[model samples]
Target: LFSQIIWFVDDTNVYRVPIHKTFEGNLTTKPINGAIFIFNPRTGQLFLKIIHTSVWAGQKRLGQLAKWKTAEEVAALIRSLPVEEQPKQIIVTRKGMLDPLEVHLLDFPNIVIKGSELQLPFQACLKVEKFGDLILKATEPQMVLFNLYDDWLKTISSYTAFSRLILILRALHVNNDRAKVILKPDKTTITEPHHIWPTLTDEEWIKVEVQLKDLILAD
Candidate 1:
């Protein structure tokens, strides 16, 4: 028999069942409807939670990774779920961390993966803000160092031939005011979307700090 009955056959046509009876019958099945993932980069841990639609219960933890797992591993776990228990949607929460599964997973035809802006939960927010404060406080000297690196990248990009020659020349000029250029973006010009510098002004940073603190303290 079907899980619930909302209509029945009569002599020549179907008729709606009584509202009270129909409503009572609808409570028979509980299905796993969605999944949520929360990743903590500091500890390299990922949490998974399952959401269900039922009268008696709402949601519960599905599983968790002791350490960070690659996107392939997580994708395999999702694929192994029973057909009936599989989720229709997946939501991920992480702060500045990228999920490789976005490109690796393709078998799930019915499931929808949601994309969102960077965000952190209470505990994650606390850890990030602590580190952010330290960096912000040291901005004066840090900006000086940053400018040196920026100049090096600009010089390297400007050369069309014998780029390696420019690097050797730049190395000889290193002094107390200059540091070794260990990393740089491959592209010469970075658009606003990809640029990470010019991070935040004093006023902007204060607004963000206040917002995060208030959110963390809220119930």
Candidate 2:
């Protein structure tokens, strides 16, 4: 003798069946073959509307694709800002059918599956322009960030020492307050594929290290 019951499919795969409710002798079942029924329990009137399965599936897929594309464009726009200003540009857009998810390209760069902790297909790259604009593009944001963190952790043993790397990490955190450290592999910044370290040579690394140390000491 329940007044009302919320009806839904028992399983997502079983979309053809109907869920029914029984109250004393009064029984109600959702019509089969893609039928939509509006029932008012108070008035006890059932209005049935027939629909096609293919139509419903198409609508669902279209909505998903719209969401995907919107997220992609918004991510690209954020990457176009200067590193220091990029953090502020990360936003979620809901203009499409599905609610746009706010994605930090640096945090989640790739197109991952729903509810899956995965990244886009490849590493995302960042490009710094003469105008101070930072552009980022990635095959997969998640994979890039995963690799970057892994490499960063691996290099800790080779540097001055683990302890020294820790100090450097601390300095990077403090000094990069305004700079967005996006994990992306830009062709402009990384033109040479054969080279182990892309555009950075040993001499350049040493030079940059010295300059960084000087800046830290000065601070």
Candidate 3:
């Protein structure tokens, strides 16, 4: 369910095969009360950067323990919580998650940093003491991108010819023209697959072919 491969046809004859991340992007950041707070770097304009984040939900020793923590120590930490509105989640980043424009940490203060590192946030519930086997509904945040580039919207960070490959055919035929392609293993439903080819309207075919040739607006 995490991958997609799309096929396209043009006059120059469908030469490339394009694969992409989820067409709608990932649910990296969670929304609170149906809203989210993200900086609109769009208005900040171009000149990009790269970011990599390693996120996971695991037992973070609040201060220190036996490295494996004594059973009583773990229980004591859990009992230290005020029963009211405590957070029922714990998502921690492995490294580089805190390189955001000059700030500091809870442990230290006024540490000089650079605009030099980065990544995303995911959500999942993680109880403190029960985090050892914290493997339920939790994902240790891995990305197919390895990391993301700043161009994240040149049809999502395009640098090569094929990165932005199938966006057009998908824009035109798949969703627009409603021509479904059931190429790989899981071909659920029968929504009149693959549109007219031989009888595929010379002008209409020419229409898409126009962009197919003129396109790939590579960056």
Candidate 4:
């Protein structure tokens, strides 16, 4: 009911499956054999700019053998950036169709029923020159943010102290004329990930923290 088309990909192609109120199958139960492309799986907000690094990375290619970086890969690579540089984009991709030419590779789509769900197999890596877009950068500022939190957590003794800090920051919502944004990972800016112990302030942060604490204490 949320979208009119289902962006689908299988062993040989990529296309959209259109659906509407006339659709008969229960969306929760349809046997979609291939994986559907979602922009930001986190928000389900349909669309975030992601492109393969190849398009801009001097057209470098693993040459069909070169692959990509997982969040972990990016997380590790991030250490070079001064501990403060919130990278613009983190690589994320929509799997493309498998190479039909490689029949040996076709031993996928291994399905084991999980109730009525149809378990699909892995899709092929997308073309590097054409990759780069998705919540992707999924790791960039996020991993940067996450990576910092773990290190930051170590600095604090109380678990909820960090948790409270998180609640505080999360609660802070959006203020400060600094204007943070959500953008195509490739085309974005930094949030000063360490800029609190790294900036300085909070209102909504405490509001939510107090509520969380109240909810816990009252019960």
Candidate 5:
């Protein structure tokens, strides 16, 4: 007997889980050709594979533009499926590269974002390498964006810089302990609503590099 049904989507390609009834190590499924757009009614797991880059399926490489459009297309496909085939909850996988905004476009009810920590044993074996590649590829664009934003911040006044820095720190959840060390101000506290770092300390900049490096090299 099958454990749970899963609707798996990777861009234009979509497949259903439990293609095989028996459970074994290194379980593999022959990918079905067309869109099925059904979900696991019992477990409510609709597994979506997050595509970070345009990959060559046969010949031509599918680009980011195609990647963006696929989100809406998949949503529409699901909407068209029969009521029984539809999912009770959607589970998004390989989501490190996926922006929160892009996932929001799906607009599905009871959606759960799946992280590396949440991966099943079989999934970990099948996807660990591919996931690393996704993170590495996605991180370059993120680094570029961060640097560009940093440059723009440099052009602004100290007051404006501090205001923005506070928000960024809060978003990153930088704690008071790390904030004190990084900002190097006397009695610094991240708990303060108006914490300011006019310029990053050498150590703080190193921290930024390490954070980005760890993410890029994550397993």
Candidate 6:
């Protein structure tokens, strides 16, 4: 028996597929609360990044780990509060304690810091102990891009015509009550808009096709 799950992250949604299933069609969606998604068959993982309003909830979850509110306002507020109200404010960054730039970057998707070009601006924001498992904000795109690009190479290996497409679907916003599945397994062979062709380079595309063909023809 197979079941399909839909993971919703604000506006963006991602569907997970079983090891035996193949992805077909161009994925599209409407804007909601600003989000994006992607899938990795090799790891059987679906990633969804969303802009959530549950800041306080997140703080509690992280055990008052950190906050990136207005630096000046927060600092002033802390100072104004009685000593009992304040828990000994400890600034996280050098730029007068908290840095707003790092806070905004935290919202970006697929953030990794393996090498250089791909590394996010904030070195302190990355909680290596917490969400590091799924978040791959490396310094270079090459680090996390291995599997994603590898799939394309396999396709090119079979002399398949390489094609690439880039589409921007604006504003298909969903509401909170929806409880959309941020990520789940695919079951039904649905030809929905969410199932769209992934953008890739011509050379990269051929590599994936050829590799896939070789594997299929092996033995």
The whole-model lDDT of each prediction reads 0.30, 0.30, 0.23, 0.27, 0.36, 0.26
Report the lDDT tens digits of candidate 2 across residue range 41-153: 22222222223334333334543543444345435533563554333222111223123433424454432212222111110111112101111221221111011222333
Candidate 1 per-residue lDDT over residues 31-81, each given as its tens digit: 322223333222222233222222114333312121123344446556665
Candidate 6 lDDT by residue in tens digits, 1-219 = 011211111111111111342367544322122112222222222233422224223234221122233322233433454644332212222332234423433432232211112111121112211223333432211112112122434444311211111101100012111111111112432223333223444654455344433433442
Model 3, span 1-219: residue lDDT tens:
011211110111001112344558843331111001111122211111111112212434322321112222212332453533121221112222222211212222322222212222111101111211222222432111111112233332332212222333333332322222211112432212221112232344345444443432321
Whose lDDT is higher: candidate 1's or candidate 4's?
A: 1
The candidates, ranked best first by lDDT, are 5, 1, 2, 4, 6, 3
The sequence of per-residue lDDT tens digits that candidate 4 reaches over residues 1-219 is 111222111221121122434356443311111112222111122221222233223333322322222222223333443533323222223232122212222222321111112222112212111122222233322211212132333434434344554333332232211112211122433235433222222443344455644443433
Tens digit of per-residue lDDT, candidate 5, span 1-219: 023234333332222223454466565543222221222323323233333322324433233434444555556655666756654444443352255314644566544334333222222212223323433344221111012123324455433433333233342333334433443443542322222123555455556545533433442
The TM-score between candidate 5 and the true structure equals 0.27
Q: How many backbone clashes does candidate 2 have?
A: 16
Instruction: Write down the lDDT that model 6 would get.
Output: 0.26
Highest-scoring model, lDDT: 5
TM-scores, all candidates, are 0.25, 0.22, 0.17, 0.22, 0.27, 0.19
Q: Give candidates' CA RMSD values in order.
A: 24.1, 24.6, 20.6, 16.7, 18.4, 19.7
Candidate 4 ranges beyond 4 A from true positions: 1-22, 28-145, 148-155, 165-208, 215-219
